[PDB]
Amino acid sequence: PRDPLLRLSNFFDDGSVELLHERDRSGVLAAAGTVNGVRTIAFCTDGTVMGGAMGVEGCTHIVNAYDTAIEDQSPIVGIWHSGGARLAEGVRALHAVGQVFEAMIRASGYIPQISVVVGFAAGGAAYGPALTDVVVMAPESSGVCHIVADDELDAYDRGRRLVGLFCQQGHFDRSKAEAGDTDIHALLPESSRRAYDVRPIVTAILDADTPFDEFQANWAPSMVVGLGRLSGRTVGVLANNPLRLGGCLNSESAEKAARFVRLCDAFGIPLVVVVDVPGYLPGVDQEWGGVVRRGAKLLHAFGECTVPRVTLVTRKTYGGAYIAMNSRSLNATKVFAWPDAEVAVMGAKAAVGILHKKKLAAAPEHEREALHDQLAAEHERIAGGVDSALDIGVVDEKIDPAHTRSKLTEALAQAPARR
Amino acid sequence: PRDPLLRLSNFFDDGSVELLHERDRSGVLAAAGTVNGVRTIAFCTDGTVMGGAMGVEGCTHIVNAYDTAIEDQSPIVGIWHSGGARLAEGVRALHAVGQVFEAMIRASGYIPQISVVVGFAAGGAAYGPALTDVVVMAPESRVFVTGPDVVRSVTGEDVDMASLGGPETHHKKSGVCHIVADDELDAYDRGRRLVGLFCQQGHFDRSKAEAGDTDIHALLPESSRRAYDVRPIVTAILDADTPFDEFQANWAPSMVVGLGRLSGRTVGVLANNPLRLGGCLNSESAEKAARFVRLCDAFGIPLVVVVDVPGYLWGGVVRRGAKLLHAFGECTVPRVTLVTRKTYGGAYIAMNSRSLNATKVFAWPDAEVAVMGAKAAVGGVDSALDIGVVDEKIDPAHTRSKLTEALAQAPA
């Protein structure tokens, strides 16, 4: 039921399991197999022996599995179900667990590491998955966990799909991009003032027949990140979500976006950045909790990034959030805008209030409103994205939204694999 | 007084200032000079022009200075005093500010970047210091993304500038400020010392290490139950003649980190501090340590890790604890660990353990390395030597020279 061989067999392609060592009561079993054709290493802790508690010989098989995966550059998948370290083994067990961590650290950014957590998971079984790239959790067991599966079988499914996304990247296909084009703009609400869930726009850009594997959907909900396929090719998507916190960036969403960029960058996965963000969320909590540093992590992640990364401005992009959301100044591949997009320091009404403050305060009370409006409409006419933005080359092209999918695909495909 | 030439001259060795461009009204003045002999680039935003608001021309001086500094491998010091980007310049100024960030990101880990905040660093200017390696704040300085104005208008909360983004709040609550200066001049002094720590790293000297040996163990309390400030232990190991430049003292204070000198050589120190939360690791102390390890690792600065924690105190701590593990595990600078009283459990693994490749692990005679305390377990250094996880049991009277020798012996 919790039998490590059953669990490994459910994970791996049907005929494919080869054990990496003799079965024993060490509390782990490691095997090679294939995942939809890809040689993959996996290990399962043994829920049947001491609740899966981790000891010296078990950790050794994990470290051995990592050495093999690293040597053959295969992805490596951990299946968890463990309540902590074998206490009776004392410091030897701590050391052996530290050795699993060191192997994960050696693997980091080099081979994909996916954790599928299927039982109660504590100690080494909490930190170990936290050193991996993706964590899939099954009900029987922030932003630590990326994907919540429906049940144990569905977790293997999502785990399997993740191997395919990292290891079977695929190729951009101009034909498939175009045949999947639609007027994505029709997905926005009628008023520019209404909030909306960005997720349908994401899934309308990405291939119709493919799941979008959103990461950490309930952590930092003003930011949506995850992996999917664009004309068959694995891409990472980052999109502000106006439904939550007005779509604003904040400490959590900056950290979520920044980790996800680093991940895609490490594995050569191009990025689609869907922007509609009015700024960072003001707040005492934000300043005091170090948003400045967090925001700096997102600037740094995009600025260092070398995979192709294309921005699509759907509605707004303002201020420091505009800079952070894969702007040209950060060395962005291409920046596209829908026809009614705006790129500005802030909204025209707020801008006018500052720029013409004294003149507004000098008008009588009863004319102040009409004047404020006239000034804001003029300020719109002057700049009002994306006109000024096009003129200085920080937006490359204003596009027909019907061609969003193909335009994005074309820009990512034309890009070098590594800037 | 906010004159940028005055500020740059106060920072640089006397008579060393060589302007990098003709002085103008762009809001920035950049120059080369020396800091105790070391060729250094600096730029100062010009608070006398539009409160130092950042614009295309001024940002361009900054990017140019970064380019010079990168080319020459010179440290680069920014002196702040800026309200944000020039609103009237629109998206042009946002772009130019993003270009400053992109230059700091290019420089990142390659040349030392030190920010000395002397007035505001607000709006887009607050992120500038955040991208650099060490932030020094003077008493008058204020760092925040959105001012009390917009805070009160959007959230209803009413806080003043000092309370929102003063050096006291950023040294304590947020960890944004590494170092707080006594005044404007002392902030330059500290930044000058930081240039020295990064760029005149020195060498280990066995003779000097041994001359400074004292009985460090005598500084611990009689009772091993008793809490005690680790900072005297740290300063007893480090050279008695040199400041210990502690980072983020008031933030996550169960972890102490900072830069000092060991027989002349710049070292980073990480030390659990039993004075706060029993010396336990937790989310923010794991983050503080991890950031500091990565910084020292980037600049070739060896580490002294002084260990006396009993465990950790879940999402934040699992994520940050992983960061720590990862930081030490990837670290390539020599780093030695000293176990003074206790190390338990997962905290033991994280605090530069042998499994994460510590250069060498020392322990005092009475240290304990265990899964948990004896009384918890029911419900020893000899053994840790046997197992291989401690390399040497030392006489605490030789703490300083034994640590120095192990660091000096690592090929680097």
PDB file of C-alpha atoms in Angstrom, chain B residues 90-305:
ATOM      1  CA  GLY B  90       7.856  60.308 -17.332  1.00  0.00           C
ATOM      2  CA  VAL B  91       8.791  56.862 -18.629  1.00  0.00           C
ATOM      3  CA  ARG B  92      12.178  58.215 -19.790  1.00  0.00           C
ATOM      4  CA  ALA B  93      13.237  58.542 -16.161  1.00  0.00           C
ATOM      5  CA  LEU B  94      11.773  55.139 -15.185  1.00  0.00           C
ATOM      6  CA  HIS B  95      13.847  53.547 -17.954  1.00  0.00           C
ATOM      7  CA  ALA B  96      16.996  55.445 -16.839  1.00  0.00           C
ATOM      8  CA  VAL B  97      16.440  54.339 -13.220  1.00  0.00           C
ATOM      9  CA  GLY B  98      15.944  50.703 -14.456  1.00  0.00           C
ATOM     10  CA  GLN B  99      19.332  51.125 -16.233  1.00  0.00           C
ATOM     11  CA  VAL B 100      20.943  51.988 -12.913  1.00  0.00           C
ATOM     12  CA  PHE B 101      19.482  48.775 -11.420  1.00  0.00           C
ATOM     13  CA  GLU B 102      20.734  46.798 -14.403  1.00  0.00           C
ATOM     14  CA  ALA B 103      24.284  48.156 -13.902  1.00  0.00           C
ATOM     15  CA  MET B 104      24.157  47.204 -10.128  1.00  0.00           C
ATOM     16  CA  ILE B 105      22.974  43.723 -11.143  1.00  0.00           C
ATOM     17  CA  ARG B 106      25.905  43.464 -13.657  1.00  0.00           C
ATOM     18  CA  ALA B 107      28.281  44.487 -10.828  1.00  0.00           C
ATOM     19  CA  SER B 108      26.637  42.113  -8.388  1.00  0.00           C
ATOM     20  CA  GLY B 109      29.189  39.778  -6.785  1.00  0.00           C
ATOM     21  CA  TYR B 110      31.886  41.176  -9.062  1.00  0.00           C
ATOM     22  CA  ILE B 111      32.869  44.441  -7.465  1.00  0.00           C
ATOM     23  CA  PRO B 112      31.955  45.447  -3.916  1.00  0.00           C
ATOM     24  CA  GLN B 113      28.905  47.862  -3.887  1.00  0.00           C
ATOM     25  CA  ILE B 114      28.416  49.873  -0.697  1.00  0.00           C
ATOM     26  CA  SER B 115      25.563  52.369  -0.194  1.00  0.00           C
ATOM     27  CA  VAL B 116      25.855  55.193   2.278  1.00  0.00           C
ATOM     28  CA  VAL B 117      22.370  56.646   2.726  1.00  0.00           C
ATOM     29  CA  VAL B 118      22.600  60.182   4.025  1.00  0.00           C
ATOM     30  CA  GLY B 119      19.157  61.673   3.188  1.00  0.00           C
ATOM     31  CA  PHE B 120      16.213  60.044   1.453  1.00  0.00           C
ATOM     32  CA  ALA B 121      16.290  57.103  -0.805  1.00  0.00           C
ATOM     33  CA  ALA B 122      12.600  57.002  -1.729  1.00  0.00           C
ATOM     34  CA  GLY B 123      10.412  55.650  -4.571  1.00  0.00           C
ATOM     35  CA  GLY B 124      12.538  54.170  -7.298  1.00  0.00           C
ATOM     36  CA  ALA B 125      15.638  55.300  -5.429  1.00  0.00           C
ATOM     37  CA  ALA B 126      14.977  52.960  -2.461  1.00  0.00           C
ATOM     38  CA  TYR B 127      15.763  49.926  -4.515  1.00  0.00           C
ATOM     39  CA  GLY B 128      19.180  51.177  -5.480  1.00  0.00           C
ATOM     40  CA  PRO B 129      20.735  50.642  -2.055  1.00  0.00           C
ATOM     41  CA  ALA B 130      18.768  47.335  -1.757  1.00  0.00           C
ATOM     42  CA  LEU B 131      20.633  45.980  -4.797  1.00  0.00           C
ATOM     43  CA  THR B 132      24.034  46.734  -3.280  1.00  0.00           C
ATOM     44  CA  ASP B 133      26.037  44.625  -0.874  1.00  0.00           C
ATOM     45  CA  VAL B 134      26.085  46.657   2.341  1.00  0.00           C
ATOM     46  CA  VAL B 135      23.804  49.559   3.334  1.00  0.00           C
ATOM     47  CA  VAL B 136      25.032  52.136   5.876  1.00  0.00           C
ATOM     48  CA  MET B 137      22.304  54.562   7.085  1.00  0.00           C
ATOM     49  CA  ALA B 138      23.082  57.930   8.727  1.00  0.00           C
ATOM     50  CA  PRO B 139      20.621  59.200  11.434  1.00  0.00           C
ATOM     51  CA  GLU B 140      18.765  61.569   9.007  1.00  0.00           C
ATOM     52  CA  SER B 141      18.359  59.023   6.265  1.00  0.00           C
ATOM     53  CA  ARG B 142      15.026  57.478   5.251  1.00  0.00           C
ATOM     54  CA  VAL B 143      14.481  54.529   2.896  1.00  0.00           C
ATOM     55  CA  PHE B 144      10.997  53.667   1.672  1.00  0.00           C
ATOM     56  CA  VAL B 145       9.181  52.872  -1.566  1.00  0.00           C
ATOM     57  CA  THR B 146       5.981  54.927  -0.846  1.00  0.00           C
ATOM     58  CA  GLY B 147       5.923  57.857   1.620  1.00  0.00           C
ATOM     59  CA  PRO B 148       3.673  58.385   4.676  1.00  0.00           C
ATOM     60  CA  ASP B 149       1.509  60.530   2.391  1.00  0.00           C
ATOM     61  CA  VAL B 150       0.501  57.701   0.154  1.00  0.00           C
ATOM     62  CA  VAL B 151       0.554  55.187   3.031  1.00  0.00           C
ATOM     63  CA  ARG B 152      -1.994  57.229   5.037  1.00  0.00           C
ATOM     64  CA  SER B 153      -4.137  57.958   1.877  1.00  0.00           C
ATOM     65  CA  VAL B 154      -4.268  54.296   0.682  1.00  0.00           C
ATOM     66  CA  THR B 155      -4.312  52.395   4.045  1.00  0.00           C
ATOM     67  CA  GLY B 156      -5.444  55.008   6.613  1.00  0.00           C
ATOM     68  CA  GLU B 157      -2.361  54.387   8.803  1.00  0.00           C
ATOM     69  CA  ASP B 158      -0.533  57.502  10.010  1.00  0.00           C
ATOM     70  CA  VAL B 159       3.255  57.133  10.530  1.00  0.00           C
ATOM     71  CA  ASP B 160       6.070  59.667  10.201  1.00  0.00           C
ATOM     72  CA  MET B 161       9.083  59.440   7.905  1.00  0.00           C
ATOM     73  CA  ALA B 162      11.481  58.203  10.604  1.00  0.00           C
ATOM     74  CA  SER B 163       9.029  55.562  11.811  1.00  0.00           C
ATOM     75  CA  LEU B 164       8.257  54.334   8.228  1.00  0.00           C
ATOM     76  CA  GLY B 165      11.875  54.167   6.923  1.00  0.00           C
ATOM     77  CA  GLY B 166      14.358  55.569   9.409  1.00  0.00           C
ATOM     78  CA  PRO B 167      17.598  53.775  10.302  1.00  0.00           C
ATOM     79  CA  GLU B 168      16.061  52.429  13.545  1.00  0.00           C
ATOM     80  CA  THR B 169      13.238  50.692  11.744  1.00  0.00           C
ATOM     81  CA  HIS B 170      15.362  49.278   8.914  1.00  0.00           C
ATOM     82  CA  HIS B 171      18.118  48.050  11.290  1.00  0.00           C
ATOM     83  CA  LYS B 172      15.503  46.251  13.435  1.00  0.00           C
ATOM     84  CA  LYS B 173      12.261  45.327  11.658  1.00  0.00           C
ATOM     85  CA  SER B 174      13.210  44.761   8.053  1.00  0.00           C
ATOM     86  CA  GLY B 175      16.963  43.924   7.883  1.00  0.00           C
ATOM     87  CA  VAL B 176      17.322  46.409   4.982  1.00  0.00           C
ATOM     88  CA  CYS B 177      19.983  48.460   6.812  1.00  0.00           C
ATOM     89  CA  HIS B 178      23.185  46.570   7.673  1.00  0.00           C
ATOM     90  CA  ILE B 179      24.967  49.257   9.590  1.00  0.00           C
ATOM     91  CA  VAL B 180      23.765  52.424  11.474  1.00  0.00           C
ATOM     92  CA  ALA B 181      26.166  55.327  11.771  1.00  0.00           C
ATOM     93  CA  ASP B 182      26.364  57.907  14.557  1.00  0.00           C
ATOM     94  CA  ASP B 183      26.235  60.766  12.051  1.00  0.00           C
ATOM     95  CA  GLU B 184      26.885  61.846   8.462  1.00  0.00           C
ATOM     96  CA  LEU B 185      30.657  61.780   8.964  1.00  0.00           C
ATOM     97  CA  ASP B 186      30.630  58.493  10.865  1.00  0.00           C
ATOM     98  CA  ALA B 187      28.600  56.989   8.011  1.00  0.00           C
ATOM     99  CA  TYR B 188      31.500  57.856   5.604  1.00  0.00           C
ATOM    100  CA  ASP B 189      33.972  56.360   8.132  1.00  0.00           C
ATOM    101  CA  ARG B 190      32.048  53.094   8.260  1.00  0.00           C
ATOM    102  CA  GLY B 191      31.745  52.962   4.464  1.00  0.00           C
ATOM    103  CA  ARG B 192      35.487  53.647   4.210  1.00  0.00           C
ATOM    104  CA  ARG B 193      36.160  50.769   6.599  1.00  0.00           C
ATOM    105  CA  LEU B 194      33.895  48.493   4.491  1.00  0.00           C
ATOM    106  CA  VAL B 195      35.920  49.396   1.348  1.00  0.00           C
ATOM    107  CA  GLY B 196      38.969  48.340   3.379  1.00  0.00           C
ATOM    108  CA  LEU B 197      37.394  45.028   4.490  1.00  0.00           C
ATOM    109  CA  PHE B 198      36.442  44.080   0.906  1.00  0.00           C
ATOM    110  CA  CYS B 199      39.443  45.422  -0.971  1.00  0.00           C
ATOM    111  CA  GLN B 200      42.326  45.133   1.475  1.00  0.00           C
ATOM    112  CA  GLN B 201      41.543  41.641   2.713  1.00  0.00           C
ATOM    113  CA  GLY B 202      45.113  41.043   3.984  1.00  0.00           C
ATOM    114  CA  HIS B 203      46.545  37.604   4.732  1.00  0.00           C
ATOM    115  CA  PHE B 204      46.576  35.273   7.681  1.00  0.00           C
ATOM    116  CA  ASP B 205      49.593  35.565   9.955  1.00  0.00           C
ATOM    117  CA  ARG B 206      50.277  32.656  12.251  1.00  0.00           C
ATOM    118  CA  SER B 207      52.435  34.728  14.634  1.00  0.00           C
ATOM    119  CA  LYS B 208      49.706  37.384  15.105  1.00  0.00           C
ATOM    120  CA  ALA B 209      47.002  34.690  15.563  1.00  0.00           C
ATOM    121  CA  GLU B 210      48.932  33.010  18.386  1.00  0.00           C
ATOM    122  CA  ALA B 211      49.889  36.284  20.081  1.00  0.00           C
ATOM    123  CA  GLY B 212      46.161  37.054  20.486  1.00  0.00           C
ATOM    124  CA  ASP B 213      45.175  33.590  21.937  1.00  0.00           C
ATOM    125  CA  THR B 214      43.207  33.941  25.210  1.00  0.00           C
ATOM    126  CA  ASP B 215      41.037  31.590  27.276  1.00  0.00           C
ATOM    127  CA  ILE B 216      37.825  32.213  25.188  1.00  0.00           C
ATOM    128  CA  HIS B 217      35.904  29.556  27.203  1.00  0.00           C
ATOM    129  CA  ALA B 218      36.177  31.650  30.371  1.00  0.00           C
ATOM    130  CA  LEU B 219      33.659  34.037  28.788  1.00  0.00           C
ATOM    131  CA  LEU B 220      30.810  31.478  28.963  1.00  0.00           C
ATOM    132  CA  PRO B 221      28.567  31.351  32.003  1.00  0.00           C
ATOM    133  CA  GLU B 222      29.180  28.850  34.812  1.00  0.00           C
ATOM    134  CA  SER B 223      25.860  27.070  34.092  1.00  0.00           C
ATOM    135  CA  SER B 224      25.370  25.465  30.666  1.00  0.00           C
ATOM    136  CA  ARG B 225      21.637  26.157  31.245  1.00  0.00           C
ATOM    137  CA  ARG B 226      22.365  29.950  31.301  1.00  0.00           C
ATOM    138  CA  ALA B 227      21.944  32.271  28.204  1.00  0.00           C
ATOM    139  CA  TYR B 228      24.849  34.592  27.394  1.00  0.00           C
ATOM    140  CA  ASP B 229      25.753  37.155  24.731  1.00  0.00           C
ATOM    141  CA  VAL B 230      27.967  35.530  22.133  1.00  0.00           C
ATOM    142  CA  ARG B 231      29.379  38.874  20.937  1.00  0.00           C
ATOM    143  CA  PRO B 232      32.234  39.028  23.487  1.00  0.00           C
ATOM    144  CA  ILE B 233      33.268  35.532  22.318  1.00  0.00           C
ATOM    145  CA  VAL B 234      33.363  36.739  18.697  1.00  0.00           C
ATOM    146  CA  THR B 235      35.359  39.836  19.587  1.00  0.00           C
ATOM    147  CA  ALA B 236      37.742  37.707  21.664  1.00  0.00           C
ATOM    148  CA  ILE B 237      38.516  35.533  18.614  1.00  0.00           C
ATOM    149  CA  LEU B 238      38.903  38.514  16.261  1.00  0.00           C
ATOM    150  CA  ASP B 239      41.815  40.993  16.428  1.00  0.00           C
ATOM    151  CA  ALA B 240      41.529  43.171  19.590  1.00  0.00           C
ATOM    152  CA  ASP B 241      42.672  46.208  17.602  1.00  0.00           C
ATOM    153  CA  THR B 242      39.898  46.166  14.944  1.00  0.00           C
ATOM    154  CA  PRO B 243      36.218  46.934  14.888  1.00  0.00           C
ATOM    155  CA  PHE B 244      33.843  44.023  14.544  1.00  0.00           C
ATOM    156  CA  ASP B 245      31.514  45.410  11.911  1.00  0.00           C
ATOM    157  CA  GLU B 246      28.331  43.598  12.907  1.00  0.00           C
ATOM    158  CA  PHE B 247      25.549  43.542  10.206  1.00  0.00           C
ATOM    159  CA  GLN B 248      21.809  43.894  11.048  1.00  0.00           C
ATOM    160  CA  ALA B 249      22.420  43.680  14.834  1.00  0.00           C
ATOM    161  CA  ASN B 250      18.798  44.336  15.733  1.00  0.00           C
ATOM    162  CA  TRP B 251      17.180  42.152  13.083  1.00  0.00           C
ATOM    163  CA  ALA B 252      17.008  38.361  13.728  1.00  0.00           C
ATOM    164  CA  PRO B 253      19.379  38.798  16.674  1.00  0.00           C
ATOM    165  CA  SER B 254      19.439  35.054  17.590  1.00  0.00           C
ATOM    166  CA  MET B 255      21.990  35.114  14.679  1.00  0.00           C
ATOM    167  CA  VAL B 256      25.039  37.411  14.788  1.00  0.00           C
ATOM    168  CA  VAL B 257      26.893  38.077  11.548  1.00  0.00           C
ATOM    169  CA  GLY B 258      29.523  40.547  10.500  1.00  0.00           C
ATOM    170  CA  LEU B 259      33.002  41.295   9.186  1.00  0.00           C
ATOM    171  CA  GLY B 260      36.193  41.688  11.190  1.00  0.00           C
ATOM    172  CA  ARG B 261      39.847  40.699  10.982  1.00  0.00           C
ATOM    173  CA  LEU B 262      41.592  37.566  12.081  1.00  0.00           C
ATOM    174  CA  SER B 263      45.395  38.086  12.321  1.00  0.00           C
ATOM    175  CA  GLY B 264      44.932  40.911   9.771  1.00  0.00           C
ATOM    176  CA  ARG B 265      42.763  38.995   7.310  1.00  0.00           C
ATOM    177  CA  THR B 266      39.110  39.959   6.585  1.00  0.00           C
ATOM    178  CA  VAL B 267      36.805  37.184   7.838  1.00  0.00           C
ATOM    179  CA  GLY B 268      33.054  36.857   8.110  1.00  0.00           C
ATOM    180  CA  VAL B 269      31.681  35.538  11.400  1.00  0.00           C
ATOM    181  CA  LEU B 270      28.326  33.779  11.935  1.00  0.00           C
ATOM    182  CA  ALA B 271      27.447  32.984  15.529  1.00  0.00           C
ATOM    183  CA  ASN B 272      24.194  31.783  17.137  1.00  0.00           C
ATOM    184  CA  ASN B 273      23.492  34.110  20.033  1.00  0.00           C
ATOM    185  CA  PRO B 274      21.974  32.293  23.029  1.00  0.00           C
ATOM    186  CA  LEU B 275      21.012  35.736  24.404  1.00  0.00           C
ATOM    187  CA  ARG B 276      17.977  35.804  22.052  1.00  0.00           C
ATOM    188  CA  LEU B 277      15.435  32.964  21.583  1.00  0.00           C
ATOM    189  CA  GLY B 278      17.924  30.477  23.175  1.00  0.00           C
ATOM    190  CA  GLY B 279      20.139  30.989  20.127  1.00  0.00           C
ATOM    191  CA  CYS B 280      17.584  29.023  18.051  1.00  0.00           C
ATOM    192  CA  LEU B 281      17.387  29.333  14.308  1.00  0.00           C
ATOM    193  CA  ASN B 282      14.106  30.608  12.843  1.00  0.00           C
ATOM    194  CA  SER B 283      12.894  32.009   9.564  1.00  0.00           C
ATOM    195  CA  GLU B 284      14.561  35.461   9.669  1.00  0.00           C
ATOM    196  CA  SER B 285      17.829  34.289  11.353  1.00  0.00           C
ATOM    197  CA  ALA B 286      18.213  31.617   8.643  1.00  0.00           C
ATOM    198  CA  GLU B 287      17.672  34.301   6.009  1.00  0.00           C
ATOM    199  CA  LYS B 288      20.234  36.639   7.704  1.00  0.00           C
ATOM    200  CA  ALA B 289      22.879  33.899   7.806  1.00  0.00           C
ATOM    201  CA  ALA B 290      22.219  32.674   4.269  1.00  0.00           C
ATOM    202  CA  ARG B 291      22.501  36.208   2.777  1.00  0.00           C
ATOM    203  CA  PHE B 292      25.700  36.807   4.709  1.00  0.00           C
ATOM    204  CA  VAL B 293      27.324  33.474   3.637  1.00  0.00           C
ATOM    205  CA  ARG B 294      26.566  34.308  -0.034  1.00  0.00           C
ATOM    206  CA  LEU B 295      28.088  37.739   0.290  1.00  0.00           C
ATOM    207  CA  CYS B 296      31.362  36.472   1.832  1.00  0.00           C
ATOM    208  CA  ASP B 297      31.451  33.625  -0.659  1.00  0.00           C
ATOM    209  CA  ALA B 298      31.167  36.118  -3.589  1.00  0.00           C
ATOM    210  CA  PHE B 299      34.131  38.176  -2.387  1.00  0.00           C
ATOM    211  CA  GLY B 300      36.498  35.387  -1.285  1.00  0.00           C
ATOM    212  CA  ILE B 301      36.058  36.222   2.428  1.00  0.00           C
ATOM    213  CA  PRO B 302      36.629  33.101   4.695  1.00  0.00           C
ATOM    214  CA  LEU B 303      34.093  32.253   7.426  1.00  0.00           C
ATOM    215  CA  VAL B 304      34.267  31.548  11.127  1.00  0.00           C
ATOM    216  CA  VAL B 305      31.097  29.807  12.282  1.00  0.00           C
TER     217      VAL B 305
END
